[model samples]
Target chain A: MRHPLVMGNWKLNGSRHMVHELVSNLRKELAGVAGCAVAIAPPEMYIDMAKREAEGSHIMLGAQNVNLNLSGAFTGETSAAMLKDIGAQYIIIGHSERRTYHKESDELIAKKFAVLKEQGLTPVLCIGETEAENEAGKTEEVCARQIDAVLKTQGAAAFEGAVIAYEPVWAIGTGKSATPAQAQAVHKFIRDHIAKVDANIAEQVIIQYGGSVNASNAAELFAQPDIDGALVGGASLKADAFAVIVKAAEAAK
Target chain B: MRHPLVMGNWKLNGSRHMVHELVSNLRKELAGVAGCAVAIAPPEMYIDMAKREAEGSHIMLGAQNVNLNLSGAFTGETSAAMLKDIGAQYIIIGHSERRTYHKESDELIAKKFAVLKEQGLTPVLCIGETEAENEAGKTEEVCARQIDAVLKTQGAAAFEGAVIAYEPVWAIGTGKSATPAQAQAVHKFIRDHIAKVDANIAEQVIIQYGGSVNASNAAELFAQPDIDGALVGGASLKADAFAVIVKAAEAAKQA
Candidate 1:
């Protein structure tokens, strides 16, 4: 079975003081929790501070995004090499915000997944369907397209050590979350889809539910068999609440 | 009467070691060069380190790019507020590479220009024409549109304290430097064009030529009447060469 992974995406947020305060509290709160793996994808600017704070702690460092190229002429972009250089263990790719705002296509996201993998950094591939698609019963179809794009580009083996964060576009930051059953259906669908290529790899890949996941709903969501963890949003900002969610993953385990 | 500004855009390059080594050497080499203002735009990752190294030195800090937003969910994007917080005094916008590779339009570039100005961070607006446009003698037309986009959005007063780098896209990284006369013609046109809106702002603005500018050709390039200094690319990577370019700007001012 895959290990539970609780990742927080502090999307475009944080200051030096907040990074210090949050990461320090998390280190103490989650010190003894070994059953669940924890990580935070801070903005590129605060990665160093996160690293310093999470040092000797269980928290792994992650970047919110990375540029396609390793280096050169691409202004305002962070490279996978640079991310790796800073000791980043994971990099989030194809987050809904990036896809919706930056026009990042699945093909490009697949490329990013391959790039992060090339640098030995786990790419937390974020896949989801918009509210319109979900309401239209295209959630499965959308998720398949998003997942298959990567499977096609990087092959099934790429999912071996990587992660998939299933964030329903409508649910994210909406303070509304998918019911346990709702999240389970998508999680099982994802695992089964990957199993098509390799059942062994399917069980190994970690799939997190990431749409407005909070302490209140985290236990129910983590209680689902296939829902390994969460890619938390707002709740992750507060150490107490995020710690509670982390504990929920532990209790569910 | 514009102060010569020799700025280095490291582009998508540099590591922790490179940031420390290059910035340290630059701090020493370009020391006390008060006549020419100097800055280096390092990759965002190394800005803090660059800041630490250039502390108490004459070298100013700059960011290669910035997002239009102050702060939000624009992942993988640095905000003007973040840049300002990190002590970045300038931000490079509308580089041809960004325009071509990232599909940054003039309207968007103008938006970026306004964003930086709003934050009191000088936007080093990079304007240039592609090889095709330059070959067809559309360089002036292209430059005008690029400049006017900002003027239309932010007004001609935007040029009052702004820095413009007239980099011919073809010449950049092509090892093809525009001749001093050729560069002067475009610089003159850019200034003259701005003059149409406000001649005072035109005269006050600094126009730098950026296209494979190196130590060897730095003097002649800086000597051009319209060309203020340079936006050095590759040569700026080497401290010795960059210092020579800085010195060249000083000598040109003296002459």
Candidate 2:
């Protein structure tokens, strides 16, 4: 039985004071929603606060991004070493936001993945196709290129402690979700791709769905054999909704 | 006679453990280097340790970069308020690294400056001209635009307690130093611009020279009438070099 992991990507929101109310709400609303690991990735400024709030609790803290270099001269970029020091166990790298906003190439993403691998931090590697690619029926092709970009550079060895998040860009925050069948089909393809590349990793790798996932759709999404968990976006902001999604993952078997 | 201020920008370097070595080095070497106010703009991760090291001394702590928003969805940004809460008295904004590398626009930088001003944190507003611009005789034009972009948006009123740092991008860390006459030209140009915008601000602002400022060139640059101080980059990492530059400011003032 694979354990489900529900992670929140709190993109560009919140302050130190607001976390008090938000975390309190989470603790109250998420009571009894257990059996799966839960995580929240807040802005870097509030990582310390997030760690304190989640300390000794089931909730884990994550950073939205980490710099490629260990600790030098990329101004405004945080490194894996700094994240480790701040008590963050996981970091989301190569998210579409980073790729789109920062012009992060796949090669650069691969370098960052290699860095995280060396540092022993889990990389929630996000791969997905945009609406244009998806509509052009190039979803699998785009996905393969992204995942293969990492595999080709980091090699099969680096997947030992990494998590793959299949975030279909069109489905992310657009209120448009992939049907359960569509999501499972892509997950199977990704898993199969990994199996051909490295069977050991293919078996251990936890592939999750991300675009527009919520309590209403999570049960059906996680019920698929290839899907292990979720990389939640806006829905994760609501503790009750996020807890339900986590419970759905817990009960997926 | 305005007091001079020197700060060390330890950009993208050091670790949680290296703080002790840095702090100890600072304490012992900076003991007699007095006169001008001194501080370290350590990486955000080491701000607390920097503050701890600055304890019982006049050395202050600062952050190299701060978010324009006091707090928000912008991931991987440090805020002046957070820096203040963690014991920072100074914050550096509009550094060229942020402009060239991080896509930090002049407006974004001005917002950061305004935010710091509102929070009672003194911002070291950095402006400079690139190598191309200098060769094209657009050095003054480039620096003027950089300064005017901030002043036009936030107004001179917001810069009441701010420090203006004139860092020529081409000279910074390039083993190239700007001649005293060349630096003084920009320094005077910046002050004159500020004076035209607001006479009160022209006198109040501390216009410091930053590019490749070392102990060797520190005296000549500091001797410039409008150049009030130095923002030591590479030399700042060494307490001896940094202290030398600080004292050079004192010596220049006397002679």
Candidate 3:
């Protein structure tokens, strides 16, 4: 059995004051919450402020993306070492936003996962299918390839304590939540795919369903056995909606 | 006459301690050097620390690159507003490093230049020629297009208080510096190009010579009438080398 884990991917969002306000409000929501872990991945620039605000709270800090190289001459890139040094607990690698805008390949994302783990930071490997890939009935094929890249590179043991977020590209920020059944199918597929390599690892890994996951749909999504929690996006920016989602996760637990 | 400005692009370098030590050491060098304005562009992570260390010092701060959108939905990118909020005075737009590695087009760099100016930050518009372009006698053609993109978008008046750095791509971080004459030719071409639109703006604009600007070559480079100062790269990380370059700029100013 896995504990629920709700994460907010504040992709390219936040300012000094906004960070302070959001983190403070999130801390209040996470204060007495138990049986469910919580985290927020802010843009790299505000991680320092988030780290300080998240200090002594159950609300963990995460980063949206990281560079493949640990350091050197890759201008405008944040490295894994920098993320760890600044006290980040988790990093979201291969988010659809990065894959879409920055041309991130599965191979590149797998390399980042290994680097994040090597640096003592957990990699929340985000794998998803595009509308085309989904409508073409290639969701399993697309998701399998994304998972296989990491399996081939980092292997079954890498998933021992790792996190996998199944974000349907079709639903992300599209105001369309995957029916709990539609999402459970992929989450189960991910679990079974990893379980074939190592049963124990499959049992341990936390597989969350992302994309349009809000307070209204959080409980239904989490109700599915394999769909652990969520990687909340737009809703995460608002403390009220995020708190409601957290409450939903706790209730599902 | 334009004031000489020597800026350091600490591209993808620095640890927490390294930033502390480098800024502390450079602060000492900046204390005595006055004629030339000095700044260092560090990776964004160290900016808060750099801001604390650079407080009340002559060393201004800069960001090596920034996202075109002011904010929102662009993951892992720092916005212009974020850079300014953390106290960056200038932003290096269109560095060849970003262009080559990140697939940045002249169009994208031009957008960045306009955004930085819109946010009240100076854009150090970096223009240059490749080795092949230089050998093929296309240096002016290459640099002109880089300048023209910005002029066409933001206008010549945008150059009034802007910074232009002429960094030959072949010489950058390659231990190869464009000879004073080679660099002066391009520097003069840039100044004249701007002057064609607005002579007053061109004369007052700061056009810096960047590619491998070490102390030994800095004096001669800055001595050129059109080469106002430098946008240093590798040499900038070393306090000693950067200090000599800073001194060279100061001495050339008095001369």
Candidate 4:
């Protein structure tokens, strides 16, 4: 039995004042949320204010991206060491948005994962197939290539204490979602792929579904055996709805 | 006469405590100094904190980069609107490090310049030729290409209230500087290129010299006709030393 973990990725949208109102509302809605772990990755600029707001709670702070390097003259890049020092517990690496916008490669993402693990910070690795790949029926093939890159670079055991978000690029921000069955197929495929190397490690790893995850369908999505929780995006901005989504995960548990 | 603007490009450097101590020291060091404008660009993470520390002081805040878009979905990127709302008055775009490390192209830099200008924020556009390009004696040609891209995209008048920083890629952090004459020639070339478009705009634009600018040589560098001020790097970390460099610009105004 794996504990469910629900996370919110605000992704380049937030303000200092929003951090206060949103965190306050979330604290009230899920005052004693149990059986579910919660985290939110606000834009890097707002992390400090959010951390200051969520103090004295189990709510963990996260960031949407960590730069490839350890930080120096790479102006406008953030390093894992800097995130760790600033109290960021989890970092989202290789999000589909970054893949499409910045041309981040699988090999580069694997390097990002290794750096985060080295600094003892959690790496929330996001993997998925794009709309074109999904249409061509190459979903599993694309996922395997992405997974294999990390497996080859850091080995299987690197999944230890790390996370995997299976977000099919087609569904993200499109008001579309993989059917619960369609999602479970890939989730199971990911675990089975890892189980080939180590079953125990495979079973213990948490696999979260992202892309258009909201309160309305979160319950059914969470009901799947392999769907641990969700990585909420737009809905995460609405504190009340986000807390409801977290409560759905808790109820599924 | 163009007002000398001395700026510190902290690059990807700074912290919460460093902001507190550094700002306090600069306030004390330049309490009565005048005739030169000063600004410090710190890590984006510390901008809000840095802003709070420098409240009611003459010191201005700057950011090293701004994202291409207005803002959205591009994780780890900052936008010009966000910086403006956060009180950042100056934005450093197309620094040599970003050009080399990220492979930033002139077209992309021109777009960044337009966005900054659109937001009514000053763009500290950095332009320079590399060591290899310099060795081949193509400095003026290289500078012309860089300048033409922006001029073509935003036109000559776009530079009316902006800044041009002439930092030779070869001189940056190598403890090497374009001899005062060497840098002035390029500055004059940049100004001359703009003068062809609009003489008043060219005369009023501030062209700064960056690269290994220290307290020891800033005076001689500032003494040049085309040399307006400096964009300090390593010495910016030493609050005491940075203030000394700013004072050099002030003394250059007197004599």
Candidate 5:
């Protein structure tokens, strides 16, 4: 059985004190829930402290982003190796933030994943459809390109235990959640697309839907055969909402 | 009296172990060098460790570069404020690497300087002519535009107690050192440009000549009236060499 994974992307909104409060509540609420896997990508500055807070617990720690380059000359960059040194089990590479703002191409994302895999770190590979791509009826085309880029570089063997997050750009933190059917369609498309390329990968990959995922619709979304879990955004900041989402996943099973 | 500021820009070099070794040597060498200062801009991963190593010593610490924004959605950026919290007293903004490789313009460099200044941290502002510009007889023109952009936003007041390095893009780490006269000429031009804006501001600004500066040529470069000190690059990796450069500056002061 594929375990449900809920990852948090705390983008540019955290401090030492705020992090302490957020993680404290998480530990308080997550003391007994061992069925679902929980992970949070806080700012790199606070990762060390966050790892400490989630210690001896099911919650894992990850980095919001990391440089593909192992080290050298590029100032103001964090590397996958550094994240590993700080006790990071997972690292988010090539998010929409990087694609849209930093002009990251699928080729660059593929190179990063190749290097991350070589370093023995798990990458939460994110693929998504922008508002324009979705409106143009090109969601599958975009997601396919992203998936193909990684598969072409690393092959299906790399997907045995990898995680795939489907974060439709328009729905991400847009207060507009993807309807259950729409999410299921995309999730199934992703799985089928993988199956066409490599059946072994399609079966092993853990596909999760992100963007406005919360307690209200978490149950409905989790019920879809292809929708394995979620990548929570704002709701993950508060312990109560996160607990509610966790309960929704448990109930869905 | 200007505070003698010395900074090590560990450009494209040093491993974690090398950093600890260099800091250890600096602590011992700088024991009695009163009335002066020192800092190192190691890779970001080592800044926390560097700060801890340099603690209770006379040495300060800083970053080689910072993001244009103070803090924001820009991933892979360290803010000036964050650097300050980690004990960065100065930040080297608009180095040639930033200007050339990152394609940072004068207006952008100006914004970076203003933000660092407002946050109570000094910016070791790097301004220099490229080999092409220098060869074209537009060295002063390039420096003028670079200075004017910052002064327009940061004001001549911002130059007070700030360290400015004249690093000719051609000579940096190319094993080609700018002659004393050549470095002094640009240093005077930068100082004169600031003086033309505000005389009091010129007096307070510390103009350091960078680019291929090392223990071998430190005395001659430091001897110039306009050359205050240096922004040592490769020489900084070795304590014995870096201290020789420091002592060379002292010897020049006595001369």
Candidate 6:
């Protein structure tokens, strides 16, 4: 009941030439491919060049991060206003790396969610339990708390037009892909939690599976009832791999 | 004995139109008005547009900040390789706002200094005392601690082709001017601190006075023997104001 979305987060990677070539190749690869929405989040520096390269393509543009404020004295930070000003439609908020590495809290990330929504941009909110949390059998609890941070402040209505990427902190870039059933359990729990507030929003919200998502397992992953699409990471950097995943999503849909 | 180096830290401001107009106007105003080095740091997004607009002009291009790592997994960060690849010559590392707001420490800023130097990019390392520290009469101690962070790791030799900007945290963008004498004292303290390690290098190093530096005060600020130039903040956004500051710097060199 959801339009599957497959997004590749280039995450602190990409050169001008790489962006030109990748955007052109993705455009060609994704052109006839149907049944799935697509977006690519490149580093801040390459967004302008990538947008210029993807001019006629259906692929949407997104950025990796932004400061919480709309605009002002925050040095070295790009604001939501500026990101939208430059034609970005999506912003990935509160990725695990950003949380663990940059110390972005649930409170702060919720603010990021609200700020992006205010800019008319979609917030691809990432929520997941760490290895410790999962080992301790608190995956659903951790995800609930993370999502609830937004619910507490921005409220459930804020989930409209927003995406949630469930990335198991242990699996991300660790070559440890979560089994479809394991991932589905959490994805279902997330959707059900949202359904509590509004069944209509729950039925339509897109929940993407991230962390080591690639072409090889993408079809089965999407076969799950709630596995709407993927927040593609490593595979998104590869035109061929990303195309296969997109087609897999298309067939599953 | 040092050529004044006036730089504008545009902080978090500017548009494509403003960059085009500002670069063109500054190029015109600063054409022959140069007796000192000139550079401006725009926000990261505008660096490309600013550089394109500033093509072949005397104005040098700079970025407000960068990630410490060369490149990898550091999301939303601009690496030194990327900055240099795109033609950024100067990087403003650890401005007071960045230190106070972003929690950048002396150790981290030192690593930033080393990383930029490794990439052959000049690091304009900013060091200064906070309002409380200044009031407590610990300006020299605080400035030394900041500089010492770099010296301990990169050594005094790393100061080559580098710059130091003394920005009192209390004065930056607050419109509070540190009297020329007050500024010179700190600048001299910084130079003398460096001189303890290498007199020749200390003599040649450019020590800039930042924080609320504008046209009316630029001449005297430049006139300070140790105040080699300015790391301009608010006044830099105005073309005519920046030009007058540059001319003041020029006249000071002649004196």
Arranged by DockQ with the best first, the candidates are 3, 1, 6, 4, 2, 5
Steric clash count of candidate 4: 0
Q: What lDDT does the true structure give each of the candidates?
A: 0.85, 0.79, 0.85, 0.84, 0.77, 0.84
**After superposition, which runs of candidate 4 have C-alpha atoms over 4 Å from their true positions?**
A173-176, B173-176
Q: TM-scores across all candidates?
A: 0.96, 0.85, 0.95, 0.95, 0.88, 0.96
DockQ for all models, in order? 0.63, 0.33, 0.65, 0.58, 0.33, 0.61
How well is each residue in A47-138 modelled by candidate 1, as lDDT tens digits?
77678788888899888888788887677667888888878887889999889889999999999998888878898999989978987999
Measured with C-alpha atoms, the lDDT of residue A29 in candidate 2 is: 70
Q: If you assessed candidate 6 against the hidden native complex, which CAPRI class would it receive?
A: medium
Stretches > 4 Å off in candidate 1: A173-176, B173-176
Q: Which candidate tops DockQ?
A: 3
- For candidate 3, lDDT tens digit of each residue in B159-248? 868999987887655556678898888899998998899888889999998777786878888788888889988888999999999888
Docking class of 4: medium
Question: What is the TM-score of chain A, computed separately for every candidate?
Answer: 0.96, 0.95, 0.96, 0.96, 0.94, 0.96
Give stretches of model 3 more than 4 Å off. Answer: A173-175, B172-176
Candidate 2 per-residue lDDT, tens place, A1-253, comes to 4677888887766665666667777877777767787889876656667677766667888878877667655555677888787778778878887787667888878887888878888889889999789888998898889988878866777888678899888876576768999999999999898889898878788787877776678898889998989988777677778778888988884
Comparing 4 and 5 on DockQ, the stronger one: 4
Measured over the true interface residues after superposition, the C-alpha RMSD of each candidate is 1.5, 3.2, 1.5, 1.9, 3.4, 1.6
In candidate 3, residue A206 scores what lDDT?
Answer: 89
Candidate 3 lDDT for residue B206: 92
Write one digit per residue (lDDT tens) for candidate 6, span B1-255. Answer: 788889998877776677888889998988886577899988777777788888888899998888876666766667888788667898999888789888889988998898998899999999898878887888899999999898867778889878999988866555566889998999999999988988888888888887677879887788889988888888888999999998898899876
- Cα misplacement distance, residue A225 of candidate 1 (Å): 1.7
- CA lDDT, candidate 1, residue A188: 96
